[PDB]
């Protein structure tokens, strides 16, 4: 009964149809706990990512003589929403699916074949959650991996697009995600090639290309913001040290 | 209610060139209704009940309300027992003591509701009620 | 549960000083065991303990032994998991100071305590700690594990103290609720109980050869 | 992990008269910390503590309206440590101790949680330890103390007496009331020979003979007191006069720590 | 061992045959395998065959209690546990592995989350009694494509099942025997069908990421040999109303978006034919049963 | 406390308490402030230079008349701004 998209072209929080939320990121936030780390703020989302490795494997069974092993762990706290969660999310099938998807995404991008007989561990903590969490996870992983000095081919950027009747809305929040179907994308560099495509609710077949194009443009802008932040941090680091 | 040119509805109408043509359209002891919190608390505990009200044109001092928990409508009798209500309104009712049936705590009112439920089947005494809140008009 | 028969899902559960006796070595398929049974005016308790080891352990090389303690209910499920695990941690802390762990490289010792019987004939888990300590000491001596001293304990008004060396040393301290200014009296009472328990334990070990 | 020679050197330094600590601290001196509060807008209160060696803890406070006749305990603590199982022994021991120190009658004034003659607020305390290098009982205690002194709760505006006629509780939509409950503090001590140490470091814990856990509340020592083993290869027995010394030390030096956590 | 070993010669041969538009079993790149469906003696007993892959499904129901949060709905659950019968590379109890979790999630999103079954028709007495429906999938032989075969088998079994007629007698209920009062079917709102695509890179990673040409290769319904050498995979679910029920591409080889849209458009022609085939088979089975019952009068 | 983001676009916070059937919950929202809201008056000559098209690529229309009704002295040529109670009643 609310005005999701007003006749004047405004959304509930005051944004327009093709505008991103506030995007803030930090690099090298936990120097004593990991080789690489980042802190991501996208709207009201708050995520901490730590990268440990490359290092000696814990067990002799998890050793590969041709490349490194990559592991991803995701922790969603009980206080990340308005209503407190009853039980833990550690062993849910949804979380395991998310972890497998992230590992398979980043296997093809990291040059794992130049670190044989090593392991790289990624630990993620989600403190606050307000819609579009998968894209934020992708962006945080990319930033933390680059901060650790690990070789890769390009950036990967995450984005979410919702479809409201006939109107595409970019970078939806919790209110919009509970009232329409959404699409999540993972884009490589500045190209049109997708690493991830995730649709979980019904969408008409003849309305998907437009959503894909809007999401691709949004992800290009996200990549620009991440690159600018990384260059600024590197300039500050090298200027004095 | 109570720079900027501020005028009330009456004041602004008198400034119009055709005020005499539209001035008549300006918008113009029963017990008080219960508060919304009180009504909600009574509804949740099972003390108060909700339903439509039907009033006929032959008698304007009596009405009937149908409730899911009762097999037959509950009578409401009296010019004061019927609050300011119209036909087809959505109202909130409250049962009346047995000493006032037609021929101060929640536990007592639940017992009274049980008595009314058991007296509807065969006893020729009709439980009565009164209106304390108007839901929809 | 795929491994148990728990019955229909819709069913509902029905809603409605101390004299001691000590014996050792009566369980066949373990290394050492003991039975402790205490009675007074208004309480009655029975306990059984069993020791398995030294045994092989999974992992990398370790230069000294490892101890694990497991507490289990009996007949009535009067305690939940968290408090049982806390008591187990306290007991493991106590018995890491008396076992000569340097003698058992790359091996483990597993200790099981069964809370068989506890009846009120006329703050409840604290009064049960001394008997657990006595039973574990007796079973470890029965199994042939090296101990530097015999450990006992006493209880007085929510405070538990464990002693060695004729009551001149402390290996464990526990305090819940109780009076804040009462510390010397608790120590004296606990030591008084400890001396009697030590005498009885030594007599049990010496007689039943 | 330390070698035999390192442990012998460190033990000889620590168990001397006067004691020599590896960083030159006094027997009662603490290490610097950083405190941040009110950084999770969706919680009623929050805090973050960063230690000088990389240890970090985050606390969140949330509330709920319950019937305080059916509900017996109005304070609940849940602890999560990264890298440990949910059923690990240390996790459950810390959970039990922290729930015992915040019980109904312990110095915690639970009368400030009462709204209406039938209902009350129940407080949920969630703890997440990101990184740690020793027993994190006192760090978590300090974080909980900091978070509870900056908590705000909804304000009731719908009646107080509802024994006979009961109405659904209703709250003001913008205003909130600061909670002024009295939280306790938990200290950990180390025993090295005949000396007592406050706030021990990771390398000092590897050579300690034993340890103590002592609670503090509004000027007095509080009930939960335990002896704890900080390592497994050097734990030994101690004489009774070291317990009294530790209690006196906590009584003497606790008020200074309180002033460091203010605001 | 539990590892399937592939030599370099086999990999090179299969990739080079793909470069020359050849498949080992003689299909074209966009050809789906033939589907055989057989119904058992009981309602809800179905066998599905796709070349060499064999899957069996069974449907059953019983009386239970509704959830407190949702007192107007019944219960529905789907179970897919794999055994070494389908191949010695499968563990007996493994519900946490990557592929099993992915398959379970895809089936759950395609069938139960999309609302293909009417769970409000499973309620008997609001808040106290309801029906609980189960679907059990048995994997007998693996030659690739368990997801599509499982989806087809579950949907056909749900459309074949019938449950006993019941009546409410005051407080309790009466379940009539089958030889008395003609059991009744379930309500199906739509019929979803899944299709899987496989992607191969005939170049190196640098050409895929920084190259201008898009020379990646896509095939439909890969066999066991083909899917052990693929670089990516995509699953899409659709119905005859031109709705995308779900899409899953969880990492792998990066693909251009136009190719993915082309795949989504190619899947629709297949699902239409599959839906028609299922409906015709069900009609023929019903006619056969009616004719036999008439002849047994 | 507001922050300027990219193009004269600012964001603030919005906090309130929701009362359900016995429960209390606090809600946090983000609130964006713009500088391209037109006055929608046909006599204006500087607002048509800040408007942007919508999702369907349509420019906003200006509705209010450039020669409105004229009252007596001293107001003349006026517009009317409404109030909640006036609209409701």
| DSSP state string for E41-106 | SSTTEEEEEETTEEEEEEEEEEEE---SS-TT--EEEEEE---GGG-TTS-SS-SSSHHHHHHHHH
Residue E78 touches chain A, beta carbons under 8 Å: no
Q: Which residue has the tokens 């008439």?
A: E294
Question: At A25, which helix (H) or strand (E)?
Answer: strand A23-27
Instruction: Report CB contact under 8 Å: F17, D174.
Output: yes
Interfacial B residues in 17-56 facing D (CB < 8 Å): 35, 37-38, 40-42, 44-45
Q: C30-61 burial by CB neighbour count: b if 16+ within 10 A, else e?
A: bbbbbbbbbeeeeeebbbbbbbbbbeebeeee
Q: How many domains does chain E have?
A: 1
In CATH, what number does C1-207 get? 3.30.230.70
Query: How far is the CA of C21 from the CAs of C24, C39, C190, in angstroms?
Result: 11, 9, 20
Instruction: Report CB contact under 8 Å: D130, A33.
Output: yes
Q: Which residue has the tokens 């305590």?
A: C113
CA pair distance E268, E70, nearest whole angstrom = 35
Contact between C197 and C203 (Cβ < 8 Å): no
Contacts of D103 (CB under 8 A, 6+ apart): D73, D75
CA pair distance D88, D239, nearest whole angstrom = 31
CA pair distance C117, C109, nearest whole angstrom = 25
Q: Which residues of B touch F78 (CB under 8 A)?
A: 5
Phi, psi of A119, deg, nearest 5: -135, 145
- Considering only the beta carbons, identify the residue of D41, D58, D126 that sits closest to A78: D126
- Considering only the beta carbons, identify the residue of F72, F80, F85 that sits closest to B1: F85
E strand residue ranges, F5-70: 10-19, 24-33
* CA-closest candidate to residue E229, choices E257, E206, E263, E202: E202
Q: Which residue has the tokens 């006992």?
A: C152
Task: Give the closest-approach CA distance of B91 to chain F in angstroms.
Answer: 20
Interfacial B residues in 13-72 facing F (CB < 8 Å): 15-16, 27, 40, 44
List residues in chain F touching A: CB distance below 8 A. Answer: 3, 5, 9, 11, 25-34, 52, 54-56, 60
Contact between D230 and D200 (Cβ < 8 Å): yes
CA pair distance F41, F63, nearest whole angstrom = 6
Structure tokens, C151: 């450990």
Contact between E143 and E86 (Cβ < 8 Å): no
Question: At C141, which helix (H) or strand (E)?
Answer: helix C129-143
Question: At E213, which helix (H) or strand (E)?
Answer: none
* CA-closest candidate to residue E256, choices A187, A184, A152: A187
Burial of B60 (0-12, 13-18, 19+ CB in 10 A): exposed
Question: At D176, which helix (H) or strand (E)?
Answer: strand D171-178
CA pair distance E264, E255, nearest whole angstrom = 13
- For residue D80, the number of C-alpha atoms closer than 13 Å in the C-beta half-sphere is 19
* CA-closest candidate to residue B119, choices B127, B109, B111: B127
Q: Which residues of F touch B1 (CB under 8 A)?
A: 83, 85
Q: Which residues of A touch D78 (CB under 8 A)?
A: 78
Contact between E47 and E54 (Cβ < 8 Å): yes
Query: How far is the CA of E24 from the CAs of D52, E10, E13, E218, in angstroms?
Result: 64, 11, 10, 15
Instruction: Say if strands B90-95 and B74-77 run parallel, antiparallel, or are unpaired.
Output: unpaired
Contact between A18 and A170 (Cβ < 8 Å): yes
CA pair distance F47, F55, nearest whole angstrom = 20
CA pair distance C201, A104, nearest whole angstrom = 63
Instruction: Report CB contact under 8 Å: F60, A16.
Output: no
Contact between F74 and F50 (Cβ < 8 Å): no
Closest residue in A to F52 (Cα–Cα) = A9
Instruction: Report CB contact under 8 Å: A96, E243.
Output: no
Closest residue in D to A82 (Cα–Cα) = D42
CA angle E251, E254, E255 (to 5 degrees): 120
Residues after which chain E is discontinuous, using a C–N cutoff of 2.5 Å: none
Structure tokens, D104: 């109904």
Contact between E264 and A209 (Cβ < 8 Å): no
Structure tokens, E145: 């494509």
Question: What is the DSSP code (8-state) at residue E34?
Answer: P
Residues in chain E: 297
| Coil, helix or strand at residue F58 | coil
Q: Which residue range(s) make up the domain with E207?
A: 6-297
| Coil, helix or strand at residue C39 | strand
Interfacial D residues in 169-228 facing A (CB < 8 Å): none
Contact between B109 and B116 (Cβ < 8 Å): no
Q: Which residue has the tokens 């009704």?
A: F69
Please name the method used to determine this structure: cryo-EM
Question: At D15, which helix (H) or strand (E)?
Answer: none
* CA-closest candidate to residue D190, choices D160, D169, D213, D172: D213
Closest residue in F to D166 (Cα–Cα) = F22
Q: Which of A4, A7, A19, A175 has the most F C-beta neighbours within 10 Å, making it the best mutation to test the interface with F?
A: A19
Asked whether residue E1 is assigned to any structural domain, the reply reads no
CA pair distance A124, A49, nearest whole angstrom = 5
Contact between E260 and E235 (Cβ < 8 Å): no
Residues after which chain B is discontinuous, using a C–N cutoff of 2.5 Å: 2, 28, 103
Query: How far is the CA of B10 from the CAs of A17, B5, B25, E136, F85, in angstroms?
Result: 43, 14, 11, 75, 14
Contacts of E12 (CB under 8 A, 6+ apart): none
Residue C105 touches chain D, beta carbons under 8 Å: no
Task: Give the closest-approach CA distance of A182 to chain D in angstroms.
Answer: 25
Contact between C162 and C175 (Cβ < 8 Å): no
Query: How far is the CA of C157 from the CAs of C82, C191, C199, in angstroms?
Result: 22, 14, 23
CA pair distance A211, A194, nearest whole angstrom = 13
End-to-end C-alpha distance for chain F, whole angstroms = 37
CA pair distance E22, B131, nearest whole angstrom = 83
- Report the topology of domain A1-241: Ribosomal Protein S5; domain 2 (3.30.230)
Structure tokens, A145: 């991996």
Q: How many CB pairs under 8 A join B and D?
A: 26
Task: Give the closest-approach CA distance of A40 to chain F in angstroms.
Answer: 16
CA pair distance A129, F30, nearest whole angstrom = 13
Contact between B128 and B77 (Cβ < 8 Å): yes
Structure tokens, A101: 């998807």
- Considering only the beta carbons, identify the residue of D224, D237, D244 that sits closest to C164: D237
* CA-closest candidate to residue D208, choices D219, D198, D217: D198
Task: Give the closest-approach CA distance of D120 to chain B in angstroms.
Answer: 17
CA pair distance A13, A10, nearest whole angstrom = 8
Instruction: Report CB contact under 8 Å: A82, F31.
Output: no
Structure tokens, D171: 């709250």
Query: How far is the CA of E208 from the CAs of A40, A113, B41, E214, F66, in angstroms?
Result: 29, 17, 66, 7, 61
CA pair distance E94, E100, nearest whole angstrom = 8
| Coil, helix or strand at residue E294 | helix
Burial of D45 (0-12, 13-18, 19+ CB in 10 A): buried
E strand residue ranges, chain F: 3-4, 10-19, 24-33
Contact between A75 and A124 (Cβ < 8 Å): yes
Q: How many CB pairs under 8 A join D and F?
A: 32
Residues after which chain A is discontinuous, using a C–N cutoff of 2.5 Å: none
Contact between C181 and C151 (Cβ < 8 Å): no
What is the SS3 string spanning B35-74? Answer: CHHHHHHHHHHCCCEEEEEECCCCCCCEEEECCCCCCCCE
In units of Å, what resolution does this entry have? 2.5
Question: At C89, which helix (H) or strand (E)?
Answer: helix C81-95
CA pair distance A119, A115, nearest whole angstrom = 8
Question: At A215, which helix (H) or strand (E)?
Answer: helix A208-240
Structure tokens, A197: 């495509």
Q: Which residues of B touch F85 (CB under 8 A)?
A: 1
Instruction: Report CB contact under 8 Å: C86, D93.
Output: yes
Q: Which residue has the tokens 């379970």?
A: E104
Instruction: Report CB contact under 8 Å: F31, A168.
Output: no
CA pair distance D258, B106, nearest whole angstrom = 49
Contact between D96 and C86 (Cβ < 8 Å): yes
CA pair distance B88, B65, nearest whole angstrom = 10
Residue D86 touches chain A, beta carbons under 8 Å: yes
Q: At what angle do helices A208-240 and E257-295 cross, to 10 degrees?
A: 140
CA dihedral over F21, F23, F26, F27, signed as positive or negative = negative
CA angle E181, E183, E185 (to 5 degrees): 150
Contact between C151 and C170 (Cβ < 8 Å): no
Query: How far is the CA of C26 from the CAs of A96, C34, C49, C139, C201, in angstroms?
Result: 49, 7, 11, 11, 17
Residue B6 touches chain F, beta carbons under 8 Å: no
Burial of E247 (0-12, 13-18, 19+ CB in 10 A): buried
CA pair distance C26, C24, nearest whole angstrom = 6
Q: How many other C-beta atoms lie within 10 A of the C-beta of residue A160?
A: 25
Count of H-run helices and E-run strands, chain C? 3, 8
CA dihedral over C141, C142, C145, C146, signed as positive or negative = positive
DSSP assignment of D192-235: ETTEEEES--HHHHTS-SEEEEEEEETTEEEEEEEEE-S-SSS-
Q: Which residue has the tokens 């009164």?
A: B130
Question: At A203, which helix (H) or strand (E)?
Answer: strand A203-204
Instruction: Report CB contact under 8 Å: F55, A43.
Output: no
Q: Which residues of C touch D227 (CB under 8 A)?
A: 93, 170, 172-174
CA pair distance E141, E118, nearest whole angstrom = 32
CA angle E48, E50, E52 (to 5 degrees): 110
CA pair distance A111, A70, nearest whole angstrom = 11
Q: B79-88 burial by CB neighbour count: b if 16+ within 10 A, else e?
A: eebbbebeee
CA angle E7, E11, E16 (to 5 degrees): 145
- Do A and D touch, 3+ Cβ pairs within 8 Å? The answer is yes
Instruction: Report CB contact under 8 Å: B35, D168.
Output: no
Residue B104 touches chain F, beta carbons under 8 Å: no
Burial of E297 (0-12, 13-18, 19+ CB in 10 A): exposed
CA pair distance C207, D77, nearest whole angstrom = 50
Q: Which residue has the tokens 């929050």?
A: D46
Task: Give the closest-approach CA distance of B94 to chain D in angstroms.
Answer: 14
Contacts of B46 (CB under 8 A, 6+ apart): B110, B113
For chain F, what is the largest distance between any 2 Cα atoms, rounded to a whole number of angstroms?
A: 56
Domains with residue ranges and CATH for chain D: 1-263 (3.30.230.70)
* CA-closest candidate to residue E133, choices E148, E117, E149: E117
Q: How many other C-beta atoms lie within 10 A of the C-beta of residue D158?
A: 20
Domain ranges of chain A: 1-241
CA pair distance A159, E67, nearest whole angstrom = 36
Task: Give the closest-approach CA distance of E237 to chain A in angstroms.
Answer: 10
Residue E105 touches chain A, beta carbons under 8 Å: yes
Contact between C36 and C135 (Cβ < 8 Å): yes
Residues after which chain F is discontinuous, using a C–N cutoff of 2.5 Å: none
| Coil, helix or strand at residue E132 | strand
Structure tokens, E244: 């995308």
Long-range own/partner contacts, residues D95-99 (CB < 8 A, 24 or more apart):
D95/C82, D96/C82, D96/C83, D96/C85, D96/C86, D97/C86, D97/D137, D97/D186, D97/D213, D97/D224, D97/D226, D98/D125, D98/D127, D98/D137, D98/D140, D98/D141, D98/D144, D98/D186, D99/D73, D99/D75
Instruction: Report CB contact under 8 Å: C169, D239.
Output: yes
Chain A neighbours, 3+ Cβ pairs < 8 A: D, E, F
Question: What is the distance of C-alpha C23 from the center of its chain?
Answer: 15
Residue B98 touches chain D, beta carbons under 8 Å: no
């Amino acid at each position: 009964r609310l005005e999701i998209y007003s006749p004047e072209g405004l959304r509930l929080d005051g944004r327009r149809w093709n505008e991103l939320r506030r995007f803030e990121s930090s690099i090298n936030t936990h120097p004593h706990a990991a080789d690489g780390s980042s802190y991501m703020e996208q709207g009201n989302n708050k995520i901490i990512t730590l990268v440990k490795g490359p290092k000696e494997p814990r067990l002799k069974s998890q050793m590969d003589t041709s490349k490194a092993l990559l592991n991803v762990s995701v922790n969603i706290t009980k206080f990340s929403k308005f209503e407190r969660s009853k039980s833990s999310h550690k062993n849910e099938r949804r979380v395991l699916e998310i972890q497998t998807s992230l590992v398979r995404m980043f296997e093809k991008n990291v040059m794992l074949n130049i670190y044989p007989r090593t392991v790289i561990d990624i630990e993620i903590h989600v403190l606050e959650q307000d819609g579009g969490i998968m894209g934020s996870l992708i962006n945080g992983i990319t930033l933390a991996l680059i901060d650790a000095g690990i070789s890769m081919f390009d950036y990967i950027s995450g984005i979410s697009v919702g479809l409201y009747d006939t109107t595409p809305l970019l970078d939806t929040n919790s209110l919009e995600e509970n009232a329409m179907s959404t699409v999540t994308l993972g884009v490589v560099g500045k190209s049109e090639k997708l690493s991830l495509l995730l649709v979980e609710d019904k969408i008409p077949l003849d309305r998907l290309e437009n959503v894909l194009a809007i999401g691709i443009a949004g992800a290009h802008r996200v990549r620009d913001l991440m690159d600018e932040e990384l260059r600024k941090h590197a300039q500050k680091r090298v200027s004095n040290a | 209610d109570r720079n900027i040119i501020t005028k009330s509805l009456v004041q602004y109408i008198e400034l119009l060139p055709n005020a005499d043509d539209i001035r008549d359209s300006i918008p113009q002891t029963f017990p008080e209704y219960y508060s919304t919190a009180r009504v909600m608390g009574g509804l949740k505990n099972g003390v108060l009940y909700q339903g439509n009200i039907q009033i006929s044109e032959y008698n304007f001092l009596e009405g009937s309300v149908s409730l899911p928990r009762f097999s037959k409508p509950v009578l409401i009798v009296g010019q004061k027992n019927l609050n300011r209500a119209f036909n087809g309104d959505q109202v909130i009712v409250e049962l009346l003591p047995q000493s006032e049936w037609k021929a101060i705590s929640d536990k007592q009112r639940r017992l009274l509701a049980k008595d009314a439920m058991i007296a509807q089947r065969s006893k020729k005494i009709q439980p009565t009620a009164k209106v304390v809140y108007i839901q929809r008009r | 549960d795929r491994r148990r028969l728990l019955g229909p899902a819709a069913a509902k559960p029905m809603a409605f000083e101390q004299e001691l006796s000590l014996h050792t070595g009566f369980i066949e398929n373990c290394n050492g065991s003991a039975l402790v049974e205490a009675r007074s005016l208004g309480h009655q308790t029975s306990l059984i303990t069993a020791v398995y080891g030294p045994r092989s352990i999974r992992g990398s090389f370790t230069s000294q032994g490892t101890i694990s303690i497991q507490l289990k209910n009996g007949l009535l499920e009067k305690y939940n998991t968290n408090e049982l695990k806390e008591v187990s941690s306290f007991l493991m802390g106590i018995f890491n100071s008396v076992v000569n762990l340097s003698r058992y490289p790359k091996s483990g010792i597993d200790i099981f305590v069964y809370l068989t019987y506890d009846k009120d004939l006329t703050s409840q888990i604290s009064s049960l700690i001394p008997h657990c300590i006595t039973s574990i000491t007796l079973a470890l001596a029965d199994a042939g594990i090296e101990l530097v001293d015999m450990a006992g304990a006493g209880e007085a008004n929510g405070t538990v103290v464990s002693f060695i060396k004729n009551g001149e040393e402390i290996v464990g301290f526990w305090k819940d609720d109780g009076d804040d200014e009462d510390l010397l009296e608790c120590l004296d009472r606990c030591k008084e109980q400890y001396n009697r328990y030590r005498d009885l334990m030594i007599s049990c070990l010496m007689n039943q050869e | 992990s330390l070698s035999v020679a390192e442990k012998s050197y460190l033990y000889d330094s620590l168990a001397s008269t006067p004691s020599i600590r590896p960083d030159g601290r006094l027997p009662h001196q603490f290490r610097p910390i950083e405190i941040f509060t009110d950084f999770l807008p969706s919680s009623n209160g929050s805090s973050r503590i960063i230690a000088s060696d990389g240890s970090e803890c985050i606390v969140s406070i949330k509330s709920k309206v319950v019937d305080h006749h059916v509900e017996n305990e109005l304070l609940q603590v849940d602890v999560d440590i990264a890298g440990q199982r949910d059923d690990a022994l240390v996790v459950e021991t810390i959970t039990s101790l922290l729930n015992k120190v915040l019980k109904s009658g312990s110095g915690v004034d639970s009368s400030k949680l009462q709204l209406t003659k039938k209902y009350s607020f129940k407080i949920f305390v969630d703890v997440l330890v990101i990184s740690s290098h020793s027993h994190p009982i006192s760090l978590i205690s300090f974080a909980i103390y900091s978070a509870l002194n900056s908590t705000y709760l909804p304000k009731l505006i719908s009646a107080f007496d509802d024994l006979e006629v009961e109405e659904l509780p209703t709250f003001h939509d913008y205003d909130m009331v600061k909670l002024d409950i009295n939280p306790p503090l938990v200290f950990i001590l180390a025993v090295v020979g005949n000396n007592m140490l406050l706030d021990p470091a990771a390398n000092e814990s590897e050579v300690a003979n034993n340890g103590l856990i002592i609670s503090w509340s509004n000027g007095k020592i509080t009930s939960p007191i335990r002896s704890v083993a900080l390592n497994d290869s050097n734990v030994k027995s101690f004489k009774p006069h070291l317990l009294k010394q530790g209690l006196a030390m906590v009584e003497k030096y606790a008020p200074d720590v309180v002033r460091s956590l203010e605001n | 061992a539990k590892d399937i070993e592939i030599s370099a010669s086999e990999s090179k041969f299969i990739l080079e045959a793909l470069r020359q538009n050849y498949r080992l079993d003689g299909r074209s790149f966009d050809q789906f395998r033939d589907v055989e469906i057989t119904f058992g003696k009981e309602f809800g007993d179905v066998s599905v065959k796709m070349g060499n892959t064999k899957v069996h499904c069974r449907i059953s129901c019983q009386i239970a209690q509704p959830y407190e949060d949702r007192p107007f709905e019944g219960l529905f659950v789907i179970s897919t546990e794999i055994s070494p019968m389908a191949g010695s590379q499968f563990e007996n109890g493994n519900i946490t592995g990557e592929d099993e979790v992915l398959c379970s999630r895809i089936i759950e999103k395609s069938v139960r989350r999309s609302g293909a079954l009417d769970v409000e028709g499973l309620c008997i007495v609001a808040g106290s009694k309801c029906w609980a429906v189960r679907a059990d999938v048995h994997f007998l032989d693996c030659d690739g494509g368990f997801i599509d075969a499982s989806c087809i088998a579950v949907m056909a079994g749900l459309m074949h099942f019938k449950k006993p007629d019941i009546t409410v007698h005051g407080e309790q209920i009466i379940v009539h025997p089958v030889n008395e009062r003609e059991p009744v079917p379930l309500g199906i709102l739509h019929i979803p069908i899944c299709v899987t695509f496989s992607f191969f890179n005939p170049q190196d990673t640098e050409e895929n990421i920084k190259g201008e040409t898009n020379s990646e290769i896509s095939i439909i319904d890969a066999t066991l040999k083909e899917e052990l050498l693929r670089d990516g995979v995509l699953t899409v679910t659709l119905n005859k109303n031109r709705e995308v029920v779900q899409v899953s591409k969880a990492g792998g080889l990066p693909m251009d978006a136009l190719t993915l849209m082309k795949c989504c458009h190619e899947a629709y022609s297949i699902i239409e034919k599959i839906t028609d085939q299922i409906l015709q088979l069900l009609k023929e089975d019903s006619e056969k049963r009616n004719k036999y019952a008439a002849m047994l009068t | 406390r507001r922050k300027r983001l990219a193009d004269g676009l600012s964001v603030t916070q919005k906090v309130f308490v929701r009362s359900r059937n016995g429960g209390a919950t606090k809600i946090v929202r983000e609130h964006y402030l713009r500088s391209d809201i037109p006055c929608l008056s046909r006599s204006c000559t500087k607002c048509p230079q800040i408007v942007v098209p919508d999702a369907q690529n349509e420019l906003p229309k200006f509705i209010l008349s450039d020669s409105p009704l004229e009252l007596s002295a001293p107001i003349g040529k006026h517009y009317v701004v409404l109030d909640t109670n006036v609209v409701l009643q």
